[PDB]
UniProtKB/Swiss-Prot annotation:
Substitution effect: residue 121 to R: Strong reduction of chromatin-associated CHK1 ubiquitination
Protein name listed in UniProt: Serine/threonine-protein kinase Chk1
Regulation of protein activity: Activated through phosphorylation predominantly by ATR but also by ATM in response to DNA damage or inhibition of DNA replication. Activation is modulated by several mediators including CLSPN, BRCA1 and FEM1B. Proteolytic cleavage at the C-terminus by SPRTN during normal DNA replication activates the protein kinase activity.
Comment field on protein domains: The autoinhibitory region (AIR) inhibits the activity of the kinase domain.
Reactions that this protein is recorded to catalyse: L-seryl-[protein] + ATP = O-phospho-L-seryl-[protein] + ADP + H(+); L-threonyl-[protein] + ATP = O-phospho-L-threonyl-[protein] + ADP + H(+)
Changes after translation: Phosphorylated by ATR in a RAD17-dependent manner in response to ultraviolet irradiation and inhibition of DNA replication. Phosphorylated by ATM in response to ionizing irradiation. Ubiquitinated. Mono or diubiquitination promotes nuclear exclusion. Ubiquitination and degradation are required to terminate the checkpoint and ensure that activated CHEK1 does not accumulate as cells progress through S phase, when replication forks encounter transient impediments during normal DNA replication. 'Lys-63'-mediated ubiquitination by TRAF4 at Lys-121 activates cell cycle arrest and activation of DNA repair.
Record bears the keyword Nucleus: yes
Reported function: Serine/threonine-protein kinase which is required for checkpoint-mediated cell cycle arrest and activation of DNA repair in response to the presence of DNA damage or unreplicated DNA. May also negatively regulate cell cycle progression during unperturbed cell cycles. This regulation is achieved by a number of mechanisms that together help to preserve the integrity of the genome. Recognizes the substrate consensus sequence [R-X-X-S/T]. Binds to and phosphorylates CDC25A, CDC25B and CDC25C.
Biological process, per Gene Ontology: apoptotic process; apoptotic process involved in development; cellular response to mechanical stimulus; chromatin remodeling; DNA damage checkpoint signaling; DNA damage response; DNA repair; DNA replication
Entire protein: shown range: 4 to 270 of 476
Active site (UniProt): 119 (proton acceptor)
Amino acid sequence: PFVEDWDLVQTLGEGAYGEVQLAVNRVTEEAVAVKIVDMNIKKEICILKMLNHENVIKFYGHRREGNIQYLFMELASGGSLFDRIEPDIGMPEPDAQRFFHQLMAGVVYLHGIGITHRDIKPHNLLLDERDNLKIADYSLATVFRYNNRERLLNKMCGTLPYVAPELLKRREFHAEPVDVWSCGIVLTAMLAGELPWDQPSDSCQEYSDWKEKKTYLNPWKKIDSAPLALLHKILVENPSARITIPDIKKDRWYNKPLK
Ligand SMILES: Nc1ncnc2[nH]cnc12
Ligand SMILES: [Cl-]
């Protein structure tokens, strides 16, 4: 299979929203990623064209060919953060910190252009050949600030183990604290190789245990006290008391020099 000058050479992803292909230009040998949708997409493309940052997947352009749309994007040949997390272990704290720094730089960037991602998780955090983190997949992304005016969200979306509790409990909620929460669950996964709860509900025992500060349980007992103090500020049930990214950047562990 092929599109104009490009050959589609191998599958990088095959989900609900189409397939992602490695695309190699037959002439130039340039490798890119191509998202293939058999036709919502108007919006995603509008958002993709806004994106210009070292920790966000760049958009190159699109081609309609009948019922098939082709979205051309920066390739991340390093795979996903998901593949760097050892189950039950996590990864070395200095690698976690570096990835967390890059993830915060990407999320500040998106929030600064009034975009919320809404599905931050290790599968959506891709690595380039230098292990640089790229926030990918803008199929659920939306505008939360336009003409300097914030709009609250009401659509429930994301992935239950990563979603903030307000998204299950409130009719409308602020976008930014939901993305901050999901970054906290990503940091837990990196440092513990395990997700803390199926979902942040009153009916979820592991969530109740965290609210009662039972940090002698897993996954918290595998996490050093410094990163764990940051996770205490991020995974705060009240989204107005939750730490903001400006304040994450003043955290002791965030600024701790590591191996
Ligand atoms: N799934 C993916 N794999 C590699 N690079 C990509 N760029 C966008 N999506 C990608
Ligand atoms: Cl995990």
